Design a protein around this ligand. Structure first.
Ligand SMILES: [Hg+2]
Ligand SMILES: [Hg+2]
Ligand SMILES: [Hg+2]
Ligand SMILES: [Hg+2]
Ligand SMILES: [Hg+2]
Length: 417
């Protein structure tokens, strides 16, 4: 019972909530803002994203690999709030008024960093946050699942306030988020007490270097998954960047796609959370490769089925699919890698693939798409990618590591012993 009476948690669980609320604003209703407010084109919206990644690549490495040597000092994660402070002004006064104010290239860029206060940041947050509750102990797997209510809830009500007014919203971005978020930095915690008074006494560190990667580039198990991720991911994550202006049309007004598109993500959280608190064994029984393979066919169905969307309702089910696979793509991504590759390579794997590869591919495939959408329409563009996507999955069938090699009852045991 070191929670109801204890602080940090009862605190860093709020900051952790009041953050995602900012998400529930940004990441869902961005395209809408762009298209529906800045009447911005489909081959140009593309650029926005294409641009982002470059900084969700160009940052996660500088960030991520800093936060370590930061300690329990809040310095980084403080100058992240000094952004989510200036949300409104930026967005209304300099983002769109640079985008819309036609001069695009040059400005997208000059506004693709407050893109990091989410992608690079979010982890930089979560990460730093646990060390906060690795010290004043409790477990945060009960603290984050506190901050996962803010996005769910932040979604619905922003869909509503967006129609009421697409701008009141950019003001809860600052208040709703900044002030409180950073006011939750006055009760803050520090100074190392009955364990680890240096970065080596109790809590170690997980490093990566040159020659490991050179041994990874060596390993084939990589090249094949490195494919599955670059092929069937970068891909499907394009479909999702703009599968909103597609969703919207189908309905009566604008207060439809919107007021209700939000209504779905939201009603598609529980469905996601209640699936996962479950997914573990579901996976360690179903294997790993298959847990991705499953994750695969779905997202591919999703893409494909979208090139056929003739009904609004449809796109409403074509949606539920999404948060119906992220668990498997996520839980799968793990229980697999850590089952086919060396513990030492681990973290490395998550750069040689994620913070570096997909982010590159995804960067281009956003523009290939960007244009393409406006060449055969979402639908047609959709008939392309989706097919491409579902194409790699089939391959990957042969490309991925077996469910039981020569040492699974000898090389892997970590959750068992
Ligand atoms: Hg907010
Ligand atoms: Hg791709
Ligand atoms: Hg969650
Ligand atoms: Hg993942
Ligand atoms: Hg990177």
């Amino acid at each position: 019972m070191y929670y109801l009476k204890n602080t940090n948690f009862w605190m860093f669980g709020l900051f952790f909530f009041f953050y995602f609320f900012i998400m529930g604003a940004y990441f869902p209703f961005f395209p809408i803002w762009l298209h529906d407010i800045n009447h911005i084109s489909k081959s140009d919206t593309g650029i926005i994203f294409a641009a982002i990644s470059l900084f969700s690549l160009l940052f996660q490495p500088l960030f991520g690999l800093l936060s370590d040597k930061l300690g329990l000092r809040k310095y980084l994660l403080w100058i992240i709030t000094g952004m989510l402070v200036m949300f409104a002004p930026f967005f209304i006064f300099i983002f769109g008024p640079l985008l819309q104010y036609n001069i695009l290239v040059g400005s997208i860029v000059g506004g693709i960093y407050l893109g990091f206060c989410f992608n690079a940041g979010a982890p930089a947050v979560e990460a730093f946050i646990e060390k906060v509750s690795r010290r004043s102990n409790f477990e945060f797997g009960r603290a984050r699942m506190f901050g996962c209510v803010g996005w769910a809830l932040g979604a619905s009500i922003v869909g509503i306030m967006f129609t009421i007014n697409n701008q009141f919203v950019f003001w809860l971005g600052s208040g709703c988020a900044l002030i409180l978020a950073v006011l939750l930095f006055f009760a803050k915690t520090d100074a190392p007490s009955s364990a680890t008074v240096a970065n080596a006494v109790g809590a170690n560190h997980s490093a990566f270097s040159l020659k490991l990667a050179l041994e990874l580039f060596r390993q084939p198990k990589l090249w094949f998954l490195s494919l599955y991720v670059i092929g069937v991911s970068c891909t499907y994550d394009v479909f999702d960047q703009q599968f909103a202006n597609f969703f919207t049309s189908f309905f009566a007004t604008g207060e439809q796609g919107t007021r209700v598109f939000g209504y779905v993500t939201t009603m598609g959280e529980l469905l996601n959370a209640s699936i996962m608190f479950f997914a573990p064994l579901i996976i360690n029984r179903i294997g790993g490769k298959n847990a991705l393979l499953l994750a695969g066919t779905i997202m591919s169905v999703r893409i494909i089925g979208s090139s056929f969307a003739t009904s609004a309702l449809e796109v409403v089910i074509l949606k539920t699919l999404h948060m119906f696979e992220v668990p498997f793509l996520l839980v799968g991504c793990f229980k697999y890698i850590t089952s086919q590759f060396e513990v030492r390579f681990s973290a490395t794997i998550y750069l040689v693939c994620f913070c570096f590869f997909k982010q590159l591919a995804m960067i281009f495939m956003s523009v290939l798409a960007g244009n393409m959408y406006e060449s055969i329409g979402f639908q047609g563009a959709y008939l392309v990618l989706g097919l491409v996507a579902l194409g790699f999955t089939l391959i990957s069938v042969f490309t991925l590591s077996g469910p039981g090699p020569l040492s699974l009852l000898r090389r892997q045991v970590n959750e068992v012993a």
